[PDB]
Amino acid sequence: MVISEKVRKALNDQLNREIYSSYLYLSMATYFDAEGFKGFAHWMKKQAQEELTHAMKFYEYIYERGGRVELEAIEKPPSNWNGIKDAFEAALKHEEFVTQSIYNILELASEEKDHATVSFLKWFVDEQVEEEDQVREILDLLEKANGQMSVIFQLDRYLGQRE
């Protein structure tokens, strides 16, 4: 194995955090479906799948550097939010935490002069920018919407079309 044990641990930890992110977004989906917003729930199911592809990227990079993955327990996520906007605020807060988590691996890797891992992490830096922005844009629309059901209906239909 040509990554350090400390960097293998950080990458393995982040893999498990990506799995939890997936599970959290699935849990938000369960909340949206309970509230009858099939389009919002669909957006979250697609988000969950996207998080799984991030975990598998960490998975394959670890083995590529001679390491091994160990899967850990996945914590029980919240299952309820105080309305659609509250759920997206929690999504944003979670994405920012993920970003900082990725930043911490990057700085560790840089400090150990593990350039291969620094470079690998660049894709996740850029992807985090995009994911934060998607949620921020949804939140700004919802702020403008205030309560309006007609606006919320359209947003649900639109996010219901995510590929």
Q: Residue 54's Cα: distance from chain center in Å?
A: 8
Q: Give DSSP secondary structure letters for 105-160.
A: HHHHHHHTT-HHHHHHHHHHHHHHHHHHHHHHHHHHHHHHHTT-HHHHHHHHHHHT
89 binds a copy of itself (CB under 8 A): no
Q: How large is the angle between the packed helices 149-159 and 115-145, nearest 10 degrees?
A: 150
The answer to whether 77 touches 20, Cβ cutoff 8 Å, is yes
Decide: 45 and 24 in contact? Cβ < 8 Å. no
80 is in an annotated binding site: no
Pick one of a copy of itself, Fe ion, none as the site partner of residue 51 (Cβ within 5 to 8 A by kind). Answer: Fe ion
Q: Quick one: which of 8, 17, 42, 54 contacts Fe ion (CB under 5 A)?
A: 54
Q: Shortest distance, CB of residue 83 to Fe ion, whole angstroms?
A: 22
Total residues interacting with Fe ion, rule: CB under 5 A: 4
Shortest Å distance, C-beta 6 to a copy of itself: 18
Distances in Å between the Cα of 74 and the Cα atoms of 16, 23, 71 are 8, 8, 9
By CB under 8 A, tell whether 107 contacts a copy of itself: yes
- Residue 157 CA to residue 155 CA, distance in Å, equals 5
Q: Is 130 annotated as a binding residue?
A: yes
Q: Binding to Fe ion by residue 131, rule CB under 5 A?
A: yes
Q: Which does 1 bind (CB under 5 to 8 A by kind): a copy of itself, Fe ion, none?
A: none
Residues making contact with Fe ion (CB under 5 A): 18, 51, 54, 131
Residues making contact with a copy of itself (CB under 8 A): 2, 19, 23, 26-27, 30, 33-34, 36, 38, 45, 56, 59, 63-66, 68-77, 79, 96, 99, 103, 106-107, 113, 115-116, 119-120, 122, 125-126, 128-130, 132-133, 136-137, 140-141, 144-146, 148-151, 153-154
Which residues sit in the known binding site for Fe cation? 18, 51, 54, 95, 128
